[model samples]
Target: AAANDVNYSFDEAVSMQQGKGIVQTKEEDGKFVEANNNEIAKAMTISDMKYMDITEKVPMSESEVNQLLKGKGILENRGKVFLEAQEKYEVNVIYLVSHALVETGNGKSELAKGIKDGKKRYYNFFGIGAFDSSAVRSGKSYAEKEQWTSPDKAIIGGAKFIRNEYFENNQLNLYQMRWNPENPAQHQYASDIRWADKIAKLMDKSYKQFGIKKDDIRQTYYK
Candidate 1:
């Protein structure tokens, strides 16, 4: 809807489209702007989001995440697993945690409850296996002793899965997985097209709130 149309306000229009899906443009400075004109940031799409003034940096501590998020539960409990994954798989642990937060209901999801015996003991923090037609079936896989017996198993296993599936194969960053900007036809991640925006928003929030360190990198190819 155009601003001149009087029949719609941006808020009403936005709210109506809430459960619809993705929006390509957003108003900026009183004008509509494409969300991915050049891509909702290339640096983050190619690599991970920047931290602070440092550029290349390390993952924040579990204590840090718990502090900023006001206690993220399994996220804090499994923090060491996330840190280890970043160092080994090269995927930033912050993103790993943030993505899990989104997928697992900010640590309130059943999986986050930790193996409870016939209740919610499964430990698939990343919600692995549940893709496409059956996030249902995939979720079920994590419950058994065969799948993930503990939080550490789930956290580390999930990281390895993401690394092999996306990171190493060239779907390197969150934005790329979110948009597959170069090839919209395939290789995208998440059903909610706005996936990257949410991920980026969380990353930005955590970086500031948790005082995460900056990376070693000094430049971005996009700029």
Candidate 2:
């Protein structure tokens, strides 16, 4: 039986959505390019699941992921560090890549480009503490505080943070990461109502692109 708070009934966890991230456009070189802005925030429909659980590991190679990440702006060629984070923390590699891609605007966001704090520069691919109200400023502060002065640090540190903060607390999948079954909507990872669904879409795409199989998934819903 899956673990739950004692106050709740022992229904157990099972698992299960699709969501789309809004894209902002910018005119550059007589063409409309995706602006490096985070997706819009919206208010949660409880939906069913078809995505892999975050706890599973993806044994993708650096070169393999690099192929997918090719032309992905700053995210290209960072697969080794991503693999390190995946091995260090028990989080899925594809999930990590998808999360970074979503949060950092495919690694083209300002914060992903590294913000300057004094003479040093810091990166924040995961957008930690970057509330939509003040994304870059808040995210920069967090990167400074965490001392993510390098890209690898930011990647590994963010993975460890997620593992400790969410995984340790049983929020092992996209749904729980947003809904927090024990508390329901409080302390959610993102303010976007469809945040989980959107990220799951990216994860699914990456998995299919590499022919990755899903395993160790756990689905949870409130009765």
Q: Could you list the CA RMSD of all candidates, in the order they appear?
A: 11.2, 7.8
Candidate 2 yields a Cα-based lDDT of 0.68
lDDT of 2 at 211: 87
User: Each model's TM-score?
Assistant: 0.59, 0.75
Q: In candidate 1, which residue pairs get closer than 3 Å at backbone N, Cα or C atoms, i.e. clash?
A: 55-215, 56-214, 56-215, 56-216, 56-217, 57-214, 57-215, 115-121, 116-121
Q: Assess each prediction's global lDDT (C-alpha) against the native.
A: 0.55, 0.68
Q: TM-score: which candidate is best?
A: 2
What does the lDDT come to for candidate 1? 0.55
Position 14, candidate 2: lDDT: 14
Lowest lDDT block of 10, candidate 1: 48-57
Residue 122's lDDT within candidate 1 is: 54
Give me the displacement of residue 36 in model 1, in angstroms. 17
